[PDB]
Design a binder for this molecule. Structure first.
Ligand SMILES: Cc1cc2nc3c(=O)[nH]c(=O)nc-3n(C[C@H](O)[C@H](O)[C@H](O)COP(=O)(O)OP(=O)(O)OC[C@H]3O[C@@H](n4cnc5c(N)ncnc54)[C@H](O)[C@@H]3O)c2cc1C
Ligand SMILES: NC(=O)c1ccc[n+]([C@@H]2O[C@H](COP(=O)([O-])OP(=O)(O)OC[C@H]3O[C@@H](n4cnc5c(N)ncnc54)[C@H](O)[C@@H]3O)[C@@H](O)[C@H]2O)c1
Ligand SMILES: O=C1O[C@H]([C@H](O)CO)C(O)=C1O
Length: 429
């Protein structure tokens, strides 16, 4: 049975960033462990949908260990041992007893803590979860962890020049459709909503990305879902059957239909809200000494006076740091500031890249141009509620422009004629 003062459960983004902050905060050898089911030390998960998939000069471990994704120092396994931070890899925790402060691995082993950080991230939703016919076929692929990414790269090699079907029109769909096309596949994206990224993109924004993709030769089939798959005698996928009776031939299927917080270890033991583990502004759960960070946390979003859960990397990094600051604060007597999060989302594909800051509520307007025949296109939007700008999006911004939209979102300036020189508005705030 192992004993640690601090245990981080999960070896992902939030775990690595927590490890960095513990080290900044003076953690001593033998005090901290990170327990992860993965076989590798924490890494910047966003690379798996982007650089990992380049057909040459691809990202690979140990390159994109944390914290290189935010311009930080890289934490190789050897950083952890030299600091006496125990990485316990290839270890899945299958039970957590918060009353006894003990965790039990799949293999029977046991681990105790005085302070626990839950950083278990999200599951990948799978068509097999739905019981979809033929969803067990080979080369139907998901992307959450580096092991999944390796399987996809291997399929991309095995099936080169063939046909790929991307199921889903969220972040994964967007990024992976682009990656497959760059890898020389005939690519078709299939999704049920009226335009891609329906939660964040407006119809205007979505139409830009759809036309851009179309121009790159990506086929887009809207208004339907996969209801079945054909497989060959070896059980490899050969076609995707759609709700509307169409069939798409496929050598590879990539599915991105959402993720859900991995919180079932704690079912009944902590308070839960909006699908995640409820926390305060310090990431502390119902149970004292038990924190929850990253994708699992439902936490108070100061600037919008609501609880929220966020499933993006910037929050994973920041929430991790905050927890460690709160823990360390309590040891010498806090105060620590409440988490004050400004939402930051972003995606890049092909030669495109956008950022969004704030909250996408209220009425929207589009500025700039907007032309999918490029180059490089530069256009944005503002979300306006109660006479204030609450949210801002920009595709193709320089660093000063991106900064300027972030400042709009953080300061919520009043407005009416923005559309006029939209970007200039941000540049003058
Ligand atoms: C492929 C991909 C690309 C993405 N790209 C972007 C992007 O470009 N921008 C952006 O904003 N967001 C992106 N995201 C979202 C972002 O990566 C997440 O918000 C972030 O990883 C959350 O970090 P976290 O540590 O909560 O969880 P995760 O990094 O998932 O870490 C969870 C860790 O806990 C381990 N775990 C879970 N249960 C157990 C257990 N029982 N025992 C031991 N270990 C366990 C997992 O294996 C993992 O190591 C991306 C996500 C994916 C999947
Ligand atoms: N740049 C980024 O921020 C980025 C990039 C990659 C992954 N991710 C994260 O990774 C996780 C997984 O992403 P995702 O794209 O899978 O989730 P997502 O929630 O961003 O979107 C999933 C999409 O799946 C579709 N959907 C739901 N059921 C479906 C079905 N039966 N058939 C077809 N489509 C269906 C909807 O169009 C929805 O838009 C999320 O937490 C996401 O935030 C983030
Ligand atoms: O935040 C990120 O982490 C990775 C970095 O580029 C990894 O260095 C990535 O691709 C991002 O968008």
């Amino acid at each position: 049975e192992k004993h640690f003062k601090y245990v981080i459960l999960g070896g992902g983004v939030a775990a690595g960033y927590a490890a960095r902050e513990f080290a900044k905060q003076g953690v001593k050898p033998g005090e901290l462990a990170i327990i992860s089911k993965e076989a590798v030390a924490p890494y910047e998960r966003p690379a798996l949908s982007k650089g990992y998939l380049f057909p040459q000069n691809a990202a690979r471990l140990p390159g994109f260990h944390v914290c290189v994704g935010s311009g930080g120092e890289r934490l190789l396994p050897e950083w952890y041992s030299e600091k006496g931070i125990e990485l316990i890899l290839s270890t899945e925790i299958v039970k957590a007893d918060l009353a006894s402060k003990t965790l039990t691995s799949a293999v029977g082993a046991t681990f105790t803590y005085e302070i626990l950080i839950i950083a278990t991230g999200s599951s990948v939703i799978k068509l097999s979860d739905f019981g979809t016919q033929g969803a067990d076929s080979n080369n139907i692929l998901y992307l959450r962890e580096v092991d999944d990414a390796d399987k996809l790269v291997a399929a991309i090699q095995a099936k080169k020049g063939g046909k790929a079907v991307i199921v889903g029109g969220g972040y994964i769909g967007l990024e992976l459709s682009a990656a497959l096309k760059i890898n020389d596949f005939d690519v078709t994206m299939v999704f049920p909503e009226p335009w891609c990224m329906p939660r964040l993109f407006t119809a205007d924004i979505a139409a830009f990305y759809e036309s851009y993709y179309t121009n790159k030769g990506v086929k887009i089939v809207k208004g339907t879902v996969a209801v079945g798959f054909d497989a060959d005698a070896n059980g490899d996928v050969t076609a995707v059957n759609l709700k509307n009776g169409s069939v798409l031939e496929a050598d590879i299927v990539v599915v991105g239909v959402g993720g859900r917080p991995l919180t079932t270890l704690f079912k009944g033991q902590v308070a839960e809200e909006k699908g995640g583990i409820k926390t305060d502004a310090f990431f502390e759960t119902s149970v004292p000494g038990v924190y929850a960070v990253g994708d699992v946390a439902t936490f108070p979003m100061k600037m919008y006076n609501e609880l929220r859960r966020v499933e993006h990397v910037d929050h994973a990094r920041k929430s991790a740091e905050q927890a460690v600051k709160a823990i360390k604060g309590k040891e010498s007597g806090e105060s620590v500031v409440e988490y004050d999060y400004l939402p930051y989302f972003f995606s890049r594909s092909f030669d495109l890249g956008w950022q969004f800051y704030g909250d996408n509520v209220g009425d929207t307007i589009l500025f700039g141009d907007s032309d999918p025949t490029s180059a490089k296109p530069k256009f944005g939007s503002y979300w306006i509620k109660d006479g204030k700008v609450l949210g801002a999006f920009l595709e193709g911004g320089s660093p000063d422009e991106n900064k300027a939209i972030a400042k709009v979102a953080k300061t919520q300036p009043p407005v009416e004629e923005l559309k006029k020189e939209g970007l200039q508005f941000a540049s003058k705030i």
